[PDB]
Design a protein around this ligand. Structure first.
Ligand SMILES: [Zn+2]
Lengths: 96, 55, 68, 117, 100
């Protein structure tokens, strides 16, 4: 897993503000559109996400390129333990 | 140096840079109106894009 | 599984002990010393240290090589 | 003092402000980012005691000492797999430095008044 | 000063009914208006092969799309046009407010 520590932190914080992330399955695309503030290859993003799928804290869905990661509440607990953040802030998807 | 060896073949033209918008293949693409589909996925997705066969 | 051609390896860092202390030689009194060079520039950080090659120093990221 | 310094270590580990290790400790020394560190003492170090006292006595660093080396890295999480309890494989530490961005706490005033007096 | 409304439709009878009802609105407000102009429809030509592979007699298919566009000129003030455009909406026609 050749990835820096900041990349996982920013991806997990991106999953906190919006509960489901989208991604385009192609390795010949290192300029990530949905996370444009930091340069990140999509290959390592999908490697980290299939690693999390093999952990078993988030769901998996496919729409022709489009990997949709549906998060569970115990997955919310695991990710908030990973960031070591208090559970005071609810997800924005849970905010009506 | 694989970051600069990865894009050693540029993708600007040809059928290597273009692929299907449904099943991602590189044979028989539709370049009518920028559909960018192959023939069979267009055939099974022709009913739900507002189409009636007339003549 | 195996090829009849031989195989060349990749640069694996072996088991090396007491290397970074080579950049801090034990002197007599409390003088902060330095045996090799550092970056005078700032595209490589101040904590980045040069190599000790035969006639030149190599930076960790910047690759600016200054010979003698 | 020991429990307060341990909870400072825990909060800096949570905040990811500390720089655990020794080369990056020297990086923080060169960047002048050394305020508190935990210094080893009376251990079986062949040619390390003079250099570790030299790096602790470099630039306005606290004189915090620890009895042994192997129990300093247990709190840091060097090989702390199985977070619910004790790991089956662990190697101790030598030096840890902290950059307390969340410095303000209940016992931090007591700690700095202990040090400065 | 002059304004125009463009109405593109997939269907034809929805286009005729909506244009006739807007003519009835423009006549119940009793304003001098240039009538609708029947722009031509476009006969779309898509021809594919039904066969996924190659075997036997080659049989094609002719796939056609129907698009019907209209323009209507208006001379009324624009706010009344906005008010009559904001009502009687339908899924399938993307209305336009032509200004020149
Ligand atoms: Zn440099």
């Amino acid at each position: 897993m050749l990835m820096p520590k900041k990349n996982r932190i920013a991806i997990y914080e991106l999953l906190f503000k919006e509960g489901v992330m989208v991604a385009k399955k192609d390795v010949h695309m290192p300029k990530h559109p949905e996370l444009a503030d930091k340069n990140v290859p999509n290959l390592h993003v999908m490697k980290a996400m299939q690693s999390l799928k093999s952990r078993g804290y988030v769901k998996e869905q496919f729409a022709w390129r489009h990997f949709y990661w549906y998060l569970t509440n115990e997955g919310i607990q695991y990710l908030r333990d990973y960031l070591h953040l208090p559970p005071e802030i609810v997800p924005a998807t849970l905010r009506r | 140096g694989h970051q600069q060896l990865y894009w050693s073949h540029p993708r600007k033209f040809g059928q290597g840079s273009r692929s299907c918008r449904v099943c991602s293949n590189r044979h028989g693409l539709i370049r009518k109106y920028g559909l960018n589909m192959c023939r069979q996925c267009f055939r099974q997705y022709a009913k739900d894009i507002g189409f009636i066969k007339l003549d | 599984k195996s090829y009849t051609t031989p195989k060349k390896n990749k640069h694996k860092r072996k088991k090396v002990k007491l290397a970074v202390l080579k950049y801090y030689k034990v002197d007599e009194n409390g003088k902060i010393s330095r045996l090799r060079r550092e970056c005078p520039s700032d595209e490589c950080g101040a904590g980045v240290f040069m190599a000790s090659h035969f006639d030149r120093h190599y930076c960790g990221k910047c690759c600016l090589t200054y010979c003698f | 003092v020991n429990t307060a310094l341990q909870e400072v270590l825990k909060t800096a580990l949570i905040h990811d402000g500390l720089a655990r290790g020794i080369r990056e400790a020297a990086k923080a020394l060169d960047k002048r980012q050394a305020h508190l560190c935990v210094l080893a003492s009376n251990c079986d170090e062949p040619m390390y005691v003079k250099l570790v006292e030299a790096l602790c006595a470099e630039h306005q660093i606290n004189l915090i000492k620890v009895d042994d080396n192997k129990k300093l890295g247990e709190w840091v999480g060097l090989c702390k797999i199985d977070r619910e309890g004790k790991p089956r494989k662990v190697v101790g530490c030598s030096c840890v430095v902290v950059k307390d961005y969340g410095k303000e706490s209940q016992a931090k005033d007591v700690i700095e008044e202990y040090f400065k007096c | 000063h002059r304004i125009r409304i463009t109405l593109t439709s997939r269907n034809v009878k929805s286009l005729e009914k909506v244009c006739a009802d807007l003519i009835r609105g423009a006549k119940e407000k009793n304003l001098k208006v240039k009538g609708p102009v029947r722009m031509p429809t476009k006969t779309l030509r898509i021809t594919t092969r039904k066969t996924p592979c190659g075997e036997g007699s080659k049989t094609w298919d002719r796939f056609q799309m129907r698009i019907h566009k209209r323009l209507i000129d208006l001379h009324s003030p624009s706010e009344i046009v906005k008010q009559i455009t904001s009502i009687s909406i339908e899924p399938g026609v993307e209305v336009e407010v032509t200004i020149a």
